[PDB]
Amino acid sequence: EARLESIEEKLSMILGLLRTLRDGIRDAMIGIREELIADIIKEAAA
Amino acid sequence: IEARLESIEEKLSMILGLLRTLNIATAGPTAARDGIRDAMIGIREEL
Amino acid sequence: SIEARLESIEEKLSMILGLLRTLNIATAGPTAARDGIRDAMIGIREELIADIIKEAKGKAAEM
Amino acid sequence: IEARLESIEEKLSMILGLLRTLNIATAGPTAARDGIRDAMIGIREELIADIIKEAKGKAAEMMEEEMNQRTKIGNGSVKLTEKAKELNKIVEDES
Amino acid sequence: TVNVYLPDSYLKGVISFSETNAIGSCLLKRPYLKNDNTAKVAIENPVIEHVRLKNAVNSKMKISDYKVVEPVNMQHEIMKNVHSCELTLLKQFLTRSKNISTLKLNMICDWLQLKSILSFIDVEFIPSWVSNWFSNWYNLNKLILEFRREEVIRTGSILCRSLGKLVFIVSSYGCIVKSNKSKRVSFFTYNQLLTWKDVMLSRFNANFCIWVSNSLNENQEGLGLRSNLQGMLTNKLYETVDYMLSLCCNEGFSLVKEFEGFIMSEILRITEHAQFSTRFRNTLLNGLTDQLTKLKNKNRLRVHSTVLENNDYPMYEVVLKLLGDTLRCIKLLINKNLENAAELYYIFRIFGHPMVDERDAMDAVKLNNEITKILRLESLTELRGAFILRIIKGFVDNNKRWPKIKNLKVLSKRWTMYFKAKNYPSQLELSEQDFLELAAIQFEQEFSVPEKTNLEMVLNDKAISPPKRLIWSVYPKNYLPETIKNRYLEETFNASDSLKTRRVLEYYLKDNKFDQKELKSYVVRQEYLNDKEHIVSLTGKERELSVGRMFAMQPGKQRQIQILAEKLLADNIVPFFPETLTKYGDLDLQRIMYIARASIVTDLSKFNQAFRYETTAICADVADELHGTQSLFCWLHLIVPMTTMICAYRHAPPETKGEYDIDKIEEQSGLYRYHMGGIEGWCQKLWTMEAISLLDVVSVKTRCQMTSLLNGDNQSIDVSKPVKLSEGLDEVKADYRLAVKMLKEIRDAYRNIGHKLKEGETYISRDLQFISKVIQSEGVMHPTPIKKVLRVGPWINTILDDIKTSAESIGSLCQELEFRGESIIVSLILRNFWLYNLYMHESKQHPLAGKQLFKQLNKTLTSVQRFFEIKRENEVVDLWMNIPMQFGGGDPVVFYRSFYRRTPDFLTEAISHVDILLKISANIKNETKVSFFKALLSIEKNERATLTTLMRDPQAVGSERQAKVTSDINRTAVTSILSLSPNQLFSDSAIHYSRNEEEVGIIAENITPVYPHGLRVLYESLPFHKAEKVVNMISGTKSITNLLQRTSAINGEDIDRAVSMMLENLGLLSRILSVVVDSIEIPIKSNGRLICCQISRTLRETSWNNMEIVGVTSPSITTCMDVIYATSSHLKGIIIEKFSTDRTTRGQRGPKSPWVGSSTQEKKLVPVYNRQILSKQQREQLEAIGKMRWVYKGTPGLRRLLNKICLGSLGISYKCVKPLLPRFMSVNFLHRLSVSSRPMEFPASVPAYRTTNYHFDTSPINQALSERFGNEDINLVFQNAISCGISIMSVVEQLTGRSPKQLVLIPQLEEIDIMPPPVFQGKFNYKLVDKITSDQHIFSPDKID
Ligand SMILES: COc1cc(C(=O)NNC(=O)c2cc(C(C)(C)N)cc(-c3ccc(F)cc3)n2)ccc1OC1CC1
């Protein structure tokens, strides 16, 4: 009943941003850098 | 019963992630269209 | 059908995930490439990652 | 509990409808032949109206014939035009 | 010191609209054919060549006394002009060809046991619809050859000659024709002078072939070709179309284009039910009449403000009547006969070629490559899902696993369990939602980009564009302003020698700072996205019969990227798509051949210009993910829209306002910038894959079974579906309904992606009938015999006019009348006609050699006479022209080639041919015919036995008994040129080449016995091999000593070398007959005949100092086998029997499957490991090392040599690659070894359908062989014996009207020997390889980490 609460909350956000079809650049930057370091770790010894 | 719920939550998380980038190319203004270029040119030297 | 009422949810939201993937690929084109934002839209692909490591280690070795 | 499942089902169904009916207009010249206009997304009719109001001259025509009009064929059987019947009468006769 | 400009003899090029306009505008001082910028520049600042042409013309009669017309208004008068008659010459040629042909016919009938047919060709009554074309061609060709001879002496020459009532003034840069009868003048190019000649030649060849076939078939049916064409009606067709094209100036070729469609409609009427045929015919007629209506305005718009504006155009009615008459002529030639319709496919050439406008096709495609396209997201994602599903299936089938998936959380439970189980659903599953939810998957890197640049990939003999700033170098200086010229001279001083070349070879060999690791960094860093110096040029070179087809061209840097992307797709991803890769050779020709069945044949010719980034990226992204790159498979739509389209042809300039930068010049008829579509051929594989994957979605949406074949530019979709609806309209209406419904579905599917299929390019049918452009109906194939023999004549397919290559080409082209057509006599007659013309009439005058050649020929002709004591000089040429070329005679077809296609041991075949030729020749004494072989065996074998010759050519002979070739004589010159180049890598490789060549032969010198095919394998296992390819690619360039100079002319050294080779190969027969040793024993047989296999083996052994070769000698089926005719009664031979009872067998099919002679080689125990990461070159290395390990076992030094090779090539030890190597389990590699130089198929010399109606029994011959030999292997090839038997069945029916019911081939056991597996003794010289691998490392593969 807890994961569903987050689920119902996020559907409203998803529809809100989908109806438009400032801050997203920073989100994209942090997102790419999130997996860039992990991929580098895997690529870099065994 | 429980794997399905967490899988649904993860898939919605990726849905939100995708929906964030979709409004930089066409839905986003051309003025801020060049903002990410500085960071991208900086990634080669940020690591 | 309690366990079947949320597996259809999963399939449907995976379908919209595929739709959004295709939409994201489509909109990052010649306009995005010239402004140097296409790679942030698609991401890094294990090949530019090796390139940066080699120069980073090469410079570190040159020390 | 159960009701929220139905609510999320409705939300997903309508999101699927919206994403199924969505259309894309490709990137191209800005109608001033100076720069490239980026791709657009929206409903088919509004995109067509905007693009046609943008188009000038012969280009517009082919667009009208390439996205609005289409080949209307039923049970095949293409009819030969009146001018093409004269070729037929000169070719298939006196042989 | 001496540079020559030998012109062309055949078209081999393109007719230019702008060059003609420039010539005419310079001569008239008014626009000609058009009022574009070309006319302006030509009027104001004409080029020096056109000024000289103008002066030459003015010195002669004045131009204002005649009506100026286009060169195409003159064909009717040019094709009807009569000069001196040439009937006696034609009679002489025909008589001599008949003599040579009767000698060969005696040869065949002697051993086929047969017992005046050439008398059916009556030379005194030639129709005169064959003679006129011969006379026209003779006169025009004489003029052209005289001009070529004159031009070789002086750089720029103008020659004037009178041909009847026409006067020609010919030059290398322009031509004029004036007609006194009509009082009119025309201006054209050197092309349009030797295309009219080609039209005359083709008309003569076609009419001659049909006349000969009709003469043969009127006395014995089945002796000639299986098609009955009237020749008078073909002459009428030629004249009518000539007149129609003359009236309709140059827009009439778009009207000639529809003859193929008309023939297709006739075939469909013959073979199908009215519903399909009427639809096709009506669709054709509507478009044809639309074009007919639109013709007049096009011409009247083009010729505005021109000298031709005052000429009158034909009205609608006259052109309509002309079309009616020509279509009547075509329809009457097809007398409801499907063989005539397939026969008439040769008329697409017989009328001439159109004059292509460089700046008009570009304009026509501009607006197609510019419009915005509205796309549906759902279909766009379904296509991506189908592509991903194809990839998944390919990996699951080949590797038994899924590709690596970045995130295993975008999958539902169904696809999650499918992932865990490592399989995929069946076609009955996979609804649309499956594609939608599959399109969410992202792959990880499964492949790789090679770090080193593949020198065999980039290096080619092609052209490249200049950079953006150095683009004014493609136009004459006179055509440009002064400021442009000054700034261009300033700019060309700052450029390097590599950024000044328009050729790839000079682009690389002249590079001073080349690096093999540069391309990897270039691709990974995406240093092509924002390139100011990027440009796409469109030189406008095209192909046949089209008003526009632009050949695109690029600078070298991005050319590398295009080549690399195409190669990576071909190597890694084109597999998984059997529909496309298997198109040519297996899929369509033989493999593919109530439940309703139908076919759709949509075209994909103009497929690239409707593609956009949004339609290509959805799959190029999957390719990038698999290969790990960022943007390498979608470069085109990322870079092309940012640059300028130029159309940089030599003459047509742009109208610049005096500014250097092309990106600043306003868009014109030849310039535009925002090109949103695709370029033709640059990303063809990806677009093909998308087209294939769209049909998967279409098939899933409906529930039909679709199979797709991609034969060229056509897509053939064969559709099946259980109709489950009957009791009304039974069978034909069901097929029609299925076809219509699926046509609607396919057109809708293509529309949703952005392609608007035209009504005139897609059609429906009941069964596929034009796959790869071959007409096959009901299992019988109807050939187009006279389509490859239209241009047979003197000096064909020769860079420099050398008789050897020209004779080989004549023979090769005429052998098709035997392979495809079912007539051997027609092919013999044509071949000997043209060979006699070449040798005895055209060798007296050579542009570069003079009379020398003929003198040489006349000496060889004397010697043979003196050797054979021939009384009459006329019958010594007959004998000489039936001797193989390998011994120094003129005969570019060996005997066996008429019965089976492939063989080992060419030498034994040549020996057998000469033996039978001397056997039938009841003109020489018996002593001399046995003395010829003693002369052949008299050798001076004491010479250097280098084993690299056998590595290059396992079937090579030594001691100068062989004929020399171009590669072996140009090798030293090419290496010497490469040694002096700025590129350090190439210079070092060329410096070490000689030593590496001398050392590669020493590795296995002390190994016995010598197995030349094992030596070939060892050769392939070394990097030297690859270098030896590059040299051979540069040897064939027509100018070796001018590679590093910008001359585009043939140097004197090259001419001297070529002439020396040509003159030295013409005396080989004289050389071998000079010395005879009388102490040589010929192995005569107990039949009174000589054993050809033993003589061949002795000759091969002696020429190599008696070094006991093994595995190369094998008997010829023509001499080790005796053919007789019975009914299940004879002594232990192979029996060939006929299924049916009918007399003849042409045009029928039988119950049996087609006979293809396969080898069933190398029973192989392949390993089980991942091979996806390895490039193709590394896989070939592993295969070569495996073959080396298999062939040589227990030989001392083998393991050390293998370790050296593995370390040199792959960089890792031999014991670390042992698991990766394949394991062969077989004892006889003399039989099972598969390697180049060793044929892997043994087909018969008849079409496939003809082999389906015979069957063979080999039990008695097996019993006889087991009685004589043991159970071990022998020399005789079995596939080849069966092939020869089938071809005998066919040829006997050809020569005699009755096909034998059964024939038996008895083996003669004195010609057959055994090949037990050999045991090798001696130690390998394994050290040398090290050095080689060090100095040829630029051609090595990438080292395995
Ligand atoms: C593919 O390259 C080759 C293949 C062969 C080949 O196939 N050798 N043949 C037999 O070993 C064989 C054995 C037997 C036995 C087992 C005794 N019954 C019978 C027959 C046989 C033949 C014709 C017939 F009409 C009937 C039976 N042949 C030979 C040489 C080849 O290339 C190298 C010379 C360069």
Residue numbers in the entry:
A (entry chain E): 173 to 193, 204 to 226, 230 to 231
B (entry chain D): 172 to 218
C (entry chain C): 171 to 233
D (entry chain B): 172 to 266
E (entry chain A): 8 to 122, 129 to 606, 626 to 1377
What does the article say, verbatim?
The polymerase is a multifunctional enzyme that is responsible for transcribing the viral negative sense RNA genome to generate polyadenylated mRNAs with a 5′ methylguanosine cap and replicating it to generate new viral genomes. The L protein contains three enzymatic domains: an RNA-dependent RNA polymerase (RdRp), a polyribonucleotidyltransferase (PRNTase), which is involved in cap addition, and a methyltransferase (MTase) that methylates the cap. Here we report a conserved allosteric inhibitory site identified on the L polymerase proteins of RSV and HMPV that can be targeted by a dual-specificity, non-nucleoside inhibitor, termed MRK-1. Functional analyses indicate that MRK-1 inhibits conformational changes necessary for the polymerase to engage in RNA synthesis initiation and to transition into an elongation mode.
To compare the binding of MRK-1 to HMPV L with that of RSV L, full-length HMPV L-P complexes were purified and the structure of the MRK-1 liganded HMPV L-P structure was solved at a resolution of 2.74 Å. The structure of MRK-1-bound HMPV “L” chain Cα backbone superposes over that of the apo enzyme with a r.m.s.d. of 1.1 Å for 1204 atoms, indicating that the structures are similar. The inhibitor binds in the groove present on the PRNTase domain next to the catalytic His1263 residue, equivalent to the RSV binding site, mimicking the same binding pose. In addition, the HMPV polymerase structure undergoes similar local structural rearrangements upon complexation with the ligand, namely re-orientation of the HMPV L His1263, Arg1264, and Phe1310 side chains that correspond to RSV L His1338, Arg1339, and Phe1385. Hence the MRK-1-liganded RSV and HMPV structures are highly similar with each other, explaining why MRK-1 has antiviral activities against both viruses. However, a structural rationale for these differences may be based on the lone sequence mismatch among amino acids with their side chains pointing toward the ligand between the polymerases’ MRK-1 binding sites; specifically, RSV Cys1388 analogous to HMPV Ala1313. The RSV Cys1388 side chain sulfur mediates favorable interactions with the fluorophenyl (closest distance to phenyl 4.05 Å) of MRK-1. The contact is missing in HMPV with substitution to Ala. Instead, an empty space is present between the alanine and the inhibitor (closest distance to phenyl 4.82 Å), which could be filled with a water molecule that would be in an unfavorable hydrophobic environment. Thus, the cryo-EM structures of the MRK-1 liganded RSV and HMPV polymerases provide insight into how the compound has broad spectrum inhibition of RSV and HMPV, while also suggesting why it has lower potency against HMPV.
